[PDB]
Paper text:
Two cognate immunity proteins, Tsi1 and Tsi3, are produced by the bacterium to inactivate the two antibacterial effectors, thereby protecting its siblings from self-intoxication. Among the delivered proteins, Tse1 and Tse3 are biochemically characterized as lytic antibacterial enzymes that degrade the peptidoglycan of recipient bacterial cells, thereby causing rapid cell lysis of competing bacteria in the environment.
The crystal structure of the Tse3–Tsi3 complex was solved by SAD phasing using selenomethionine-substituted protein and was refined at 1.9 Å resolution. The two protein molecules form a compact complex with overall dimensions of 60 × 58 × 93 Å, and the molar ratio of Tse3 and Tsi3 agrees well with the 1:1 stoichiometry observed in solution. The refined structure at 1.9 Å resolution also unexpectedly shows three calcium-binding sites in Tse3, one resembling the EF-hand motif and the other two being non-EF-hand sites close to the catalytic Glu residue. Three loops of Tsi3 insert deeply into the groove of Tse3 and completely occlude its active site, which forms the structural basis of Tse3 inactivation.
Residue numbers in the entry:
A (entry chain A): 2 to 12, 20 to 408
B (entry chain B): 22 to 145
Write the structure that this text describes.
């Protein structure tokens, strides 16, 4: 192929040469044929060996794994062979909890899933908030990945370990009175937050797994909605509520505590999914195949929860789980639930949110922030999520 | 400060209300729910109990006496696991029991307010 020829002609290369080769692989119309040619000539292994440092290797590997099908396993083998004298591979920086071949496999599965589920294509571009303090300063607002945040100061790590109240408070949910938080925002302020949240590109740990630029969060949310018979308005409401009750500091703690020596069971990312819960309910089922999933370390799971597409899918899958569970309950056994949400319709939960009473959205909100269907309810989360939902119902809000 | 209004049960239990909590009377004591409409309100109850605690619970120093207790944890939601403390201290030939709950995504809560409440309580 033209691409394999170009690559062989350029065969550590400079950063310029590497970016050229990667660009060529990504613009290739016949990725499989190109890989076959390179595998035959023996130049593929050379490509993998000569493209470093890890940043560039990640781009190359993600591109190849994502675009190949008939030749993907030969590519994987060539990569493996190239790693014989390079134990480090792509296992650095944000990706230190992914063995290099796991990185390859994640990129492959994700590309396939984005294609299959309908969130591969880009189209939004911006724009993110510049906030770094206060409510709505987490990744939902800012697009700054929790894995990119600077290490928390050592002394703060120690005080957090010892449960020092001031320090714990600094790194925890910023909101007390939820009603008051909402009442200070105009309807336009609220729409602005929702649009900022869903309109910006996903903050992803695997950008080159996509055929082009990463998709908007809205595109991924619509895909998840289709997969789990939800709506992007509902997924959006749950996430916007979480992200209002989120700061940059909390993002830093959420992730760093999860991957520390303590392996903390924090709620992480857009939908604030708990690590052990992602594991227990296999919340990445529809993006990653069983072999990858069975291989993932706990810290790899936490890290994935910091990647927006994995998090959105996990969030949606969990929402559908909570709804299905509700649809199996006996309302007579949930008198407090009936008291708080007297128009709740448990059977309706089995179907699409377009047909749920609003009391169903309120109840599910309680049972997303807390243990689900135990008849113990959050007094404030239902109204908080319901306000977000109302915002997403605004005709100014459009999803793919 | 932690406490304001002095509350007195007909059964002789006397304790001060935690500041910012709504208080109601229960069968053998008082129930406190954190005020407002919060995401994850603390919930506490303090009661006279005449029967001794179950045997072989963990113990801790409380004031000049001891207390026996157990904390349980379960999956909750995005605000973290659900945690509940049950603790008892002697009061003469009887006991005072505090139970308390809150969610935490950062491991077991200190339950500092519940322990302060248990220490503050007395039987008349
Ligand atoms: Ca939060
Ligand atoms: Ca969190
Ligand atoms: Ca609940």
């Amino acid at each position: 192929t033209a691409t394999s020829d170009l690559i062989e002609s350029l065969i550590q290369v400079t950063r310029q040469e590497a970016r050229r080769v990667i660009a060529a692989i990504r613009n290739d119309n016949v990725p499989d044929a190109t890989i076959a040619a390179l595998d035959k000539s023996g130049s593929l292994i050379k490509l993998f060996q000569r493209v470093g440092p890890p940043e560039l290797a990640r781009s190359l590997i993600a591109s190849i794994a994502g675009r190949t099908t008939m030749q993907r396993y030969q590519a994987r083998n060539a990569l493996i062979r190239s790693l014989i004298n390079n134990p480090l591979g792509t296992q650095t920086d944000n990706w230190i909890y992914f063995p290099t071949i796991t990185f390859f496999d994640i990129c492959a599965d994700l590309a396939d899933a984005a294609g299959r589920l309908g969130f591969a294509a880009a189209g939004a571009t911006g724009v993110a908030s510049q906030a770094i303090q206060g409510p709505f300063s987490g990744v939902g607002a800012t697009g700054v990945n929790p894995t990119d945040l600077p290490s928390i100061a050592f002394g703060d790590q120690l005080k957090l370990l010892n449960k020092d109240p001031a320090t714990v408070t600094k790194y925890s949910n910023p909101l007390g009175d939820l009603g008051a938080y909402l009442s200070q925002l105009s309807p336009q302020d609220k729409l602005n937050q929702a649009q900022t949240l869903v309109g910006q590109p996903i903050s992803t740990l695997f950008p080159d797994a996509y055929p082009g630029n990463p998709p908007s969060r809205a595109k991924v949310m619509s895909a998840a909605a289709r997969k789990y018979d939800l709506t992007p308005q509902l997924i959006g409401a749950i996430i916007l509520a979480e992200q209002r009750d989120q700061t940059r500091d909390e993002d830093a703690k959420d992730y760093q505590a999860a991957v520390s020596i303590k392996s903390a069971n924090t709620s992480i990312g857009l939908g604030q999914v708990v690590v052990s819960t992602a594991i227990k309910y296999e919340l990445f089922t529809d993006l990653l195949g069983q072999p990858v999933r069975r291989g993932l370390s706990r810290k790899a799971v936490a890290t994935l929860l910091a990647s927006d597409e994995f998090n959105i899918f996990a969030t949606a899958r969990y929402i559908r789980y909570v709804a299905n569970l509700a649809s199996q309950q006996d309302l007579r056994k949930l008198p407090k639930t009936r008291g708080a949400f007297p128009s709740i319709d448990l059977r309706a939960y089995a179907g699409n949110p377009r047909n749920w009473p609003r009391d169903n959205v309120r109840a599910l909100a309680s049972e997303y922030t807390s243990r689900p269907w135990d008849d113990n309810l959050s007094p404030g989360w239902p109204m908080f999520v319901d306000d977000a939902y109302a915002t997403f119902l605004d005709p100014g809000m459009r999803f793919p | 400060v932690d406490f304001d209004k002095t509350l007195t049960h007909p059964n002789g239990l006397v304790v001060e209300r935690p500041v910012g909590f709504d208080a109601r009377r229960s069968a053998e004591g008082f129930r406190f729910d954190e005020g407002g409409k919060l995401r994850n309100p603390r919930q506490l109850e303090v009661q006279r109990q005449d029967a001794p605690p179950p045997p072989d619970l963990a113990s801790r120093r409380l004031g000049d006496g001891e207390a026996r207790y157990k904390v349980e944890e379960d999956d909750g939601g995005s605000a973290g696991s659900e945690y509940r403390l049950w603790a008892a201290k002697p009061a003469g030939a009887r006991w005072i029991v505090v139970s308390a709950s809150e969610q935490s995504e950062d491991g077991e809560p200190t339950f500092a307010l519940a322990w302060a409440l248990l220490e503050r309580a007395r039987l008349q």
